[PDB]
Design a protein around this ligand. Sequence first.
Ligand SMILES: *[C@@H]1O[C@H](CO)[C@@H](O)[C@H](O)[C@H]1NC(C)=O
Lengths: 90, 103, 104, 99
Amino acid sequence: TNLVKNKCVNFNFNGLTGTGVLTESNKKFLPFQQFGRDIADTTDAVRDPQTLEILDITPCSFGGVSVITPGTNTSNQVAVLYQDVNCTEV
Amino acid sequence: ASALGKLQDVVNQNAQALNTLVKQLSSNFGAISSVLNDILSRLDKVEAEVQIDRLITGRLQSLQTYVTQQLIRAAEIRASANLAATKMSECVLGQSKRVDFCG
Amino acid sequence: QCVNLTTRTQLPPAYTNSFTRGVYYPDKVFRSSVLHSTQDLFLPFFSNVTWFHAIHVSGTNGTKRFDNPVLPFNDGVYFASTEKSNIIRGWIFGTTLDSKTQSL
Amino acid sequence: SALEPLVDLPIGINITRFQTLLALHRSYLTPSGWTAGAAAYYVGYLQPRTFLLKYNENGTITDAVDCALDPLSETKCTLKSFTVEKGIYQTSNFRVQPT
Ligand SMILES: *[C@@H]1O[C@H](CO)[C@@H](O)[C@H](O)[C@H]1NC(C)=O
């Protein structure tokens, strides 16, 4: 299925499955290799089988919603803080 | 580089347990696999229920281990923080008469 | 065919010590400047390694010694050679070294 | 020496024994020809062992360390580091075994 770049996608590569944000990446694999991995034994970076390229995997961002409010006494108005995102996914 | 070990130890132990806490995700805990979906993929749910328990029971426990560590470890820092706030108040802001409290 | 020249020779297998040797990549996963630890089949360091000779001239005149034995595979096998002029090609790996089993 | 896997093949057979192969030729009348040049090689048997693998920035493994090699090598597998700081470290326990 056509590959998705810079957009949250479920995926399967060569049977490897996960969900992340696939990007272009400059880390450099030796020929025979398949995965990359991080310190945590997550699957960090994968290589596209059909067109060899080094694709990062960053699972889609998430964070705690924080409702900032004065006392409900003074107002009903809230200002929401989405923690640790770029402002798009709103 | 060893003068800062006190700080360096704090930062490490935090990043330490996190690594350990993460690596606990990859442990079977008696379940057939550490990937939560594989148990769902291979097995019909009615049995897979019992499997996922051993993951959950394992992992859910493994949090309480991590959480309890942080509580205990924070209670140390909480004690060290007061020692600073004591020095900061007495030593920096005032002049200390306490022998070898300020060094 | 099956032309044969056993030319059996005596003397003990000349041993050696593999210092740091036989470390392959036991995965395709690309890792960078990390310390990874697995328990797998390897040739352990400081090991006993037999420097064998398939053909061995010990000089008087000629005297080429064809010694290369059939060797057990055991757990796993390591191999090393120099052979500026190739005389080595492949290996016969198998079990019966005959029919009744497959042959590598 | 880092060795990449060449091909991962469906073999499905147990191989308990083997021998190498050779390339020889024929000669003609001199005081038949065989045993071209000299031939020697190295063989050693594998074994399960725990190695710590140090990749490089480019993934080229240089330093590997066996854990069971000596009582000193087993501690470096506990710190995961090739640098071992001055001090005392507790390597895996030992037991006396029954006669
Ligand atoms: C986050 O999004 C804003 C636009 O809403 C943009 O101006 C900013 O550069 C982005 N920052 C990151 C982390 O990409």
